[PDB]
């Protein structure tokens, strides 16, 4: 069991690095996703002006 708990800690430290980086990357994806969705209105409203 002593070796077991130590093994579980190293698995957790590996988990930690991964989930942390997922979050960092998801922020970037989420940010540019919103822009991609709403750009049609940013341009659409701007074009209604001339129309």
């Amino acid at each position: 069991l002593d070796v077991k708990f130590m093994a579980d800690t190293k698995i957790a430290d590996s988990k930690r690095a991964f989930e942390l980086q997922k979050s960092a990357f998801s922020e970037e994806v989420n940010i540019k996703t919103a822009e991609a969705q709403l750009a049609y209105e940013l341009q659409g409203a701007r074009e209604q002006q001339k129309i």
Binding site: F5, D8, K15, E19, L20, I31, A34, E41
Partner: protein
């Protein structure tokens, strides 16, 4: 041996939960910023419309 593992787990879980909370709410913040730019132009049409009236 269990305690030694339990404390690191909780310690790492603080950061994982913290970073997850940030990532989770990161979408709506940009949606607000984007709408901020859009609404300016939506009502800008009113100004141009009134000017021709």
């Amino acid at each position: 041996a269990q305690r030694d593992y339990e404390l690191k787990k909780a310690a790492y879980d603080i950061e994982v939960n913290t970073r997850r909370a940030q990532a989770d709410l990161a979408y709506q913040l940009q949606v607000a910023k984007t709408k901020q730019q859009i609404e300016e132009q939506r009502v800008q049409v009113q100004v141009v419309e009134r000017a021709q009236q």
